[PDB]
């Protein structure tokens with residue numbers, strides 16, 4: 718079932734922003750959002766695509782494990798953290814596009830398409846360049862579709878090995894303390910309008926898990942920190958986290 722709570726719209730308008738948060742209570746099998754329509758509108762996944770891309774690369778042996786070093790190609794880019802060696806953990810942490818573009822080239826069009834259909838991932842459409850379709854190609858996914866995919870990953874139900882799913886969930890680790898654990902991935906889509914930011918993942922508690930997927934308009938990079946800040950304000954309001 719699904720419930721629309723427009724009171725959360727305050728968390729966006731108070732920041733001169735527009736967007737959607739979608740929450741899913743796993744124990745109760747109930748969903749909540751501020752905007753049912755936008756919750757089902759499909760956007761470019763941008764760097765949230767690093768979740769399925771990592772899974773596929775691991776399961777096919779393109780990536781051996783989370784310690785394998787992907788050497789910097791020596792081309793200076795404008796994101797300083799990209800101009801260095803990475804492993805799967807740090808490439809996810811710093812959303813290192815050029816590492817994941819090489820993953821996609823080694824995966825190839827045929828295997829990438831087959832695996833995204835097996836995952837039931839978004840519109841399953843990889844039209845465009847194999848090394849950039851999640852940034853400016855035909856693939857699209859909604860917030861509710863992100864949750865559907867993440868629930869499968871959490872339960873090790875995706876059609877890749879258990880090992881691959883465990884490794885990616887390790888690489889998604891974002892925050893942990895005595896009260897909760899967050900495993901998640903950010904995204905920032907600029908090449909096609911509307912420019913948006915994403916944050917998708919889940920909050921692990923002692924006796925429940927809350928899945929979340931949010932996106933918001935992102936006219937400039939100045940607002941990127943609002944992706945996590947708005948989401949955590951909703952979690953606090955619903956007393957999911959202190």
Ligand SMILES: CN(C)c1cccc(-c2cccc(C(=O)O)c2)c1
Pocket residue numbers: 764795796811812903904905938941
């Ligand atoms: C010119 N581009 C590629 C650009 C510009 C501004 C910021 C980023 C960026 C880099 C790393 C992570 C993230 C994020 O998702 O927080 C965003 C990228």
Ligand SMILES: [Cl-]
Pocket residue numbers: 886887890
């Ligand atoms: Cl972990």
